[PDB]
PDB file of C-alpha atoms in Angstrom:
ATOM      1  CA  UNK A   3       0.000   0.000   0.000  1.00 36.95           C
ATOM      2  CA  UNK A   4       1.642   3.080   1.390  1.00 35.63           C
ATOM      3  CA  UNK A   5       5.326   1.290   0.686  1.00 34.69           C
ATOM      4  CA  UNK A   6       4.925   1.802  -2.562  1.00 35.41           C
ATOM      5  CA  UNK A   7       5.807   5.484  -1.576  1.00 34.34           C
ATOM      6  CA  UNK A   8       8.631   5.130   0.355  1.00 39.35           C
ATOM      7  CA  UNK A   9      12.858   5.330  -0.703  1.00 37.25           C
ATOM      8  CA  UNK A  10      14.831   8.473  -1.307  1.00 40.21           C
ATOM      9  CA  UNK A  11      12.930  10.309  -4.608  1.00 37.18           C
ATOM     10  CA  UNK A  12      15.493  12.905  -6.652  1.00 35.93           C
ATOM     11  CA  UNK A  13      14.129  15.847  -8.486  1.00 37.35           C
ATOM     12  CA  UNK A  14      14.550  15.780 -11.994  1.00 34.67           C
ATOM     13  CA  UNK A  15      11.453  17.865 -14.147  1.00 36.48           C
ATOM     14  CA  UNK A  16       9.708  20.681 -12.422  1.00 35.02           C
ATOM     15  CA  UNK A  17       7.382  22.442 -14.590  1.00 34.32           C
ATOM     16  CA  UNK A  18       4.754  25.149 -13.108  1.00 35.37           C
ATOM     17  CA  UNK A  19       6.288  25.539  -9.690  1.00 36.89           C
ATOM     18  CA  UNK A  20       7.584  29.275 -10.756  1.00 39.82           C
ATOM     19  CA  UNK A  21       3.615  30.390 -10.851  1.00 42.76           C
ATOM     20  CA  UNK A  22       2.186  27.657  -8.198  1.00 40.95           C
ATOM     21  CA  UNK A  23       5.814  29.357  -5.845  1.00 39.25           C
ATOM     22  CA  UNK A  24       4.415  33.053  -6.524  1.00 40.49           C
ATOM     23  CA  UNK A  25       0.784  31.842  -5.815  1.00 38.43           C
ATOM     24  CA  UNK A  26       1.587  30.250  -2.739  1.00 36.78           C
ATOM     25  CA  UNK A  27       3.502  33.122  -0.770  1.00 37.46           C
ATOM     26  CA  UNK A  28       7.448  32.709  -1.445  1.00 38.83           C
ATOM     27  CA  UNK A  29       9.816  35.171  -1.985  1.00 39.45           C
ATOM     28  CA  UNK A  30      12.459  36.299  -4.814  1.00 34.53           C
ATOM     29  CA  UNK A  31      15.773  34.897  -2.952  1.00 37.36           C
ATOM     30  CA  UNK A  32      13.239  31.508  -1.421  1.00 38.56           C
ATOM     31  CA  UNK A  33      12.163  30.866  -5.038  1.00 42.86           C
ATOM     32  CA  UNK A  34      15.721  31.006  -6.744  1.00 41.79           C
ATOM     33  CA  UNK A  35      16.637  28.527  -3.687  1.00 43.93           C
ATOM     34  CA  UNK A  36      14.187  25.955  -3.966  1.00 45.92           C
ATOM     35  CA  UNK A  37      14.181  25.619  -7.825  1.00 47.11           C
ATOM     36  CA  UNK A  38      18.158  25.606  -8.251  1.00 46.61           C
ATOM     37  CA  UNK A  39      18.766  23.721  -4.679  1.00 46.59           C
ATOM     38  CA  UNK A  40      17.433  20.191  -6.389  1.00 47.23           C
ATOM     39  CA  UNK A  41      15.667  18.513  -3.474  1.00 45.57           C
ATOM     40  CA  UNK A  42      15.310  14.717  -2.546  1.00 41.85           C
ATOM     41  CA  UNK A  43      12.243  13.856  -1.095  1.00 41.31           C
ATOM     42  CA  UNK A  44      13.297  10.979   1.696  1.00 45.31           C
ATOM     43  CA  UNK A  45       9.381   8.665   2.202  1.00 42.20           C
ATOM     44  CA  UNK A  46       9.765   6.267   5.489  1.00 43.24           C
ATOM     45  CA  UNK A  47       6.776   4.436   7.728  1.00 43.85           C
ATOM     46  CA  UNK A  48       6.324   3.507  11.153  1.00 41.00           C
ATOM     47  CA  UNK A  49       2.865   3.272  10.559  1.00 37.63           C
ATOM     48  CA  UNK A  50       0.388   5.982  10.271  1.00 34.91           C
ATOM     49  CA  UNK A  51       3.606   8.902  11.354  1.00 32.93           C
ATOM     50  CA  UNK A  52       5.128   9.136   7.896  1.00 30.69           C
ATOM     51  CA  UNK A  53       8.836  10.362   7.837  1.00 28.54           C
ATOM     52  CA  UNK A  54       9.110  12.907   5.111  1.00 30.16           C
ATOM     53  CA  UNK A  55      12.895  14.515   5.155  1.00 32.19           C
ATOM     54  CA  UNK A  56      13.244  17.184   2.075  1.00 29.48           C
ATOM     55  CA  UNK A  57      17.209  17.064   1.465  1.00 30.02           C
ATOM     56  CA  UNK A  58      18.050  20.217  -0.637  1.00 31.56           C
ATOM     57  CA  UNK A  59      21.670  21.190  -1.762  1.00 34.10           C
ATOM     58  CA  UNK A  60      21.039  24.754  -0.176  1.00 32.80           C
ATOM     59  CA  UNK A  61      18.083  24.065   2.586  1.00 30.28           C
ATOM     60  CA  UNK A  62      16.366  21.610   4.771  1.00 27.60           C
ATOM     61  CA  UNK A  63      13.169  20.386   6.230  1.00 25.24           C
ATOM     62  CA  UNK A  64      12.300  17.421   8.511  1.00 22.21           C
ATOM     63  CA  UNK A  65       8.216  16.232   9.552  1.00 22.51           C
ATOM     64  CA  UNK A  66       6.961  13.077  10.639  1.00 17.49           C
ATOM     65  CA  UNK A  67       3.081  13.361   8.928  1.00 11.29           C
ATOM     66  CA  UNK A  68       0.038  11.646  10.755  1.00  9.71           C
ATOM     67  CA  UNK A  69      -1.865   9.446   7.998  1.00 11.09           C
ATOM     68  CA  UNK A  70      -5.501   9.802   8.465  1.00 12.47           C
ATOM     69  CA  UNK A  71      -5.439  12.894  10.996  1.00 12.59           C
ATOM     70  CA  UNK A  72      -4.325  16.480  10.912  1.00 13.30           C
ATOM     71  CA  UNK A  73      -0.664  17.974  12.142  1.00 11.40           C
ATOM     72  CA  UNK A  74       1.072  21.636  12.492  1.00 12.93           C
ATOM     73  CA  UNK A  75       3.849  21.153   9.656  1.00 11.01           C
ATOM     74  CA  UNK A  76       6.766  23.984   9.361  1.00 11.16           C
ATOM     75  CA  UNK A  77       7.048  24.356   5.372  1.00  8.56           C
ATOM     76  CA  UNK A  78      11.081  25.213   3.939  1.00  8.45           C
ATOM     77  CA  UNK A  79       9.922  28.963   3.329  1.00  6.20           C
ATOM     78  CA  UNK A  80       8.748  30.249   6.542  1.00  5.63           C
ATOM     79  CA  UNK A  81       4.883  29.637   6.501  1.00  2.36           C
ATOM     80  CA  UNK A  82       3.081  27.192   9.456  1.00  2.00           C
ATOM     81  CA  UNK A  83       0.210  24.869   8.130  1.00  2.00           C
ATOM     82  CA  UNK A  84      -2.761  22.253   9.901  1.00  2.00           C
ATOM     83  CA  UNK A  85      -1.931  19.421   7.491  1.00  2.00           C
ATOM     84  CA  UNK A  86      -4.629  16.758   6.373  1.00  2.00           C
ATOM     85  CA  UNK A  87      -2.536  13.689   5.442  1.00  2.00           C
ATOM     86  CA  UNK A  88      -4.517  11.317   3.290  1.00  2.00           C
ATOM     87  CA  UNK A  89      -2.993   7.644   1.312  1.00  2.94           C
ATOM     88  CA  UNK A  90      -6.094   6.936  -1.625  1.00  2.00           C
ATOM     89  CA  UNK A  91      -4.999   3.589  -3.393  1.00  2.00           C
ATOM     90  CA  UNK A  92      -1.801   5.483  -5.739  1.00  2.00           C
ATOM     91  CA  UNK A  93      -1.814   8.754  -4.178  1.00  2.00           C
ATOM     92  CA  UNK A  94      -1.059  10.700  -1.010  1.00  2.00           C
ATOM     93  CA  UNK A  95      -2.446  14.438  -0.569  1.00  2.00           C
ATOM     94  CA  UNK A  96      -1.069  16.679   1.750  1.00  2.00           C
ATOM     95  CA  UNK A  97      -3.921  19.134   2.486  1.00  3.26           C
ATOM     96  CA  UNK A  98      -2.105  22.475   3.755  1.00  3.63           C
ATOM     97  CA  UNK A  99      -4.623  24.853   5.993  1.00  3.63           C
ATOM     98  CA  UNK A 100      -3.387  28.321   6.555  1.00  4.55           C
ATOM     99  CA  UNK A 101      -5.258  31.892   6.991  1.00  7.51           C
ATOM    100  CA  UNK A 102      -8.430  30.970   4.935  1.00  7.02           C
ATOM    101  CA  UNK A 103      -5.620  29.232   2.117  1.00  5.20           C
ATOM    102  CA  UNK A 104      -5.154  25.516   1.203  1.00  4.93           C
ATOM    103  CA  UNK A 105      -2.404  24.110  -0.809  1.00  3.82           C
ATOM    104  CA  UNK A 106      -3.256  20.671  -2.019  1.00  2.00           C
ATOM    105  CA  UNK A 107      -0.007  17.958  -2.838  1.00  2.00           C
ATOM    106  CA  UNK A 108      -0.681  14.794  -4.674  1.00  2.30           C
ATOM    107  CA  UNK A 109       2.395  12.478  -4.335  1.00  4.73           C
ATOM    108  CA  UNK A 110       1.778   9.688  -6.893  1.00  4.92           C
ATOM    109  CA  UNK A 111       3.402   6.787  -8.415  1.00  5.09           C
ATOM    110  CA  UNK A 112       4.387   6.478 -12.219  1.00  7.04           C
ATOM    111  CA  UNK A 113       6.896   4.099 -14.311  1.00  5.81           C
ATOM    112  CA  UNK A 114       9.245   3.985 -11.007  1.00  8.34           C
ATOM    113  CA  UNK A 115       8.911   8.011 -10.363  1.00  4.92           C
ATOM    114  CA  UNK A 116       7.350   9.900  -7.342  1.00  3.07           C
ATOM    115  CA  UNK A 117       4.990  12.309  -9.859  1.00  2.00           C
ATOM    116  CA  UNK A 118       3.850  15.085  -7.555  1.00  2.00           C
ATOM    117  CA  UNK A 119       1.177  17.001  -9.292  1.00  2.00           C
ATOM    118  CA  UNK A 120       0.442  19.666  -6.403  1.00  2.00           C
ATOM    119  CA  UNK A 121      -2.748  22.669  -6.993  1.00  2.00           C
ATOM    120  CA  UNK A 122      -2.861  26.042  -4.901  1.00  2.00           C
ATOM    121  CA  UNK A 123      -6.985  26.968  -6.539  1.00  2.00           C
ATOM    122  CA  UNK A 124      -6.317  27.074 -10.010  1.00  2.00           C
ATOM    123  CA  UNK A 125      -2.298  27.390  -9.873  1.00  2.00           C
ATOM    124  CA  UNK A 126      -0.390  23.647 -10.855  1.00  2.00           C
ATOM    125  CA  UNK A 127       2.789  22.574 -10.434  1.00  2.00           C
ATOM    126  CA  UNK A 128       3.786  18.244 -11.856  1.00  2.00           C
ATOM    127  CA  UNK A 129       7.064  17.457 -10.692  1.00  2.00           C
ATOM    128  CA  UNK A 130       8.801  14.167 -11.074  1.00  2.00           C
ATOM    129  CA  UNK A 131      11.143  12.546  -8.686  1.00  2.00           C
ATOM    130  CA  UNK A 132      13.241   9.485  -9.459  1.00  2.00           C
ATOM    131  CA  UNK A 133      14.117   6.420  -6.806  1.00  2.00           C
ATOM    132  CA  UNK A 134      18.020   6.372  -5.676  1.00  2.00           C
ATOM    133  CA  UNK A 135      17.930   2.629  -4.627  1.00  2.00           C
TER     134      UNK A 135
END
């Protein structure tokens, strides 16, 4: 099921995250850093706390997500979110709640590749992720 999900993922295509970046809240100097930084997304279970590490060559961010329940993540920028974590079959959304503003991350499986197609409203961004194993 959720293993499916989990290794150490390594950013290769990002296309949209420029727009869904400005949509979202990030500035100048955080945008440059987390398109050139590269980041590999690190997926590990214990069982419904998900380990999530994102491993950037520039910055770093750490969260253990509860599957089936809501949390307080930290994002890499600077903004604090109550986080619906849900696993449907293929795909895990992270449901980001902050000030009246979601951010909605689907995490999917494709060929081998972590495809994350993540929506602001009407804002995308698809990014693939390859496994290092």
């Amino acid at each position: 099921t959720v293993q499916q999900l989990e290794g150490r993922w390594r950013l290769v295509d990002s296309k949209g995250f420029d727009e869904y970046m400005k949509e979202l809240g990030v500035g100048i100097a955080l945008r440059k850093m987390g398109a050139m930084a590269k980041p590999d997304c690190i997926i590990t279970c214990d069982g419904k706390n998900l380990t999530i590490k994102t491993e950037s060559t520039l910055k770093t961010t750490q969260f253990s997500c509860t599957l089936g329940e809501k949390f307080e993540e930290t994002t890499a920028d600077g903004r604090k979110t109550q986080t619906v974590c849900n696993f449907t079959d293929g795909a895990l959304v992270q449901h980001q709640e902050w000030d009246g503003k979601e951010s909605t991350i689907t995490r999917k499986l494709k060929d081998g590749k972590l495809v994350v197609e993540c929506v602001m409203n009407n804002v995308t961004c698809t990014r693939i992720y390859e496994k290092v194993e």
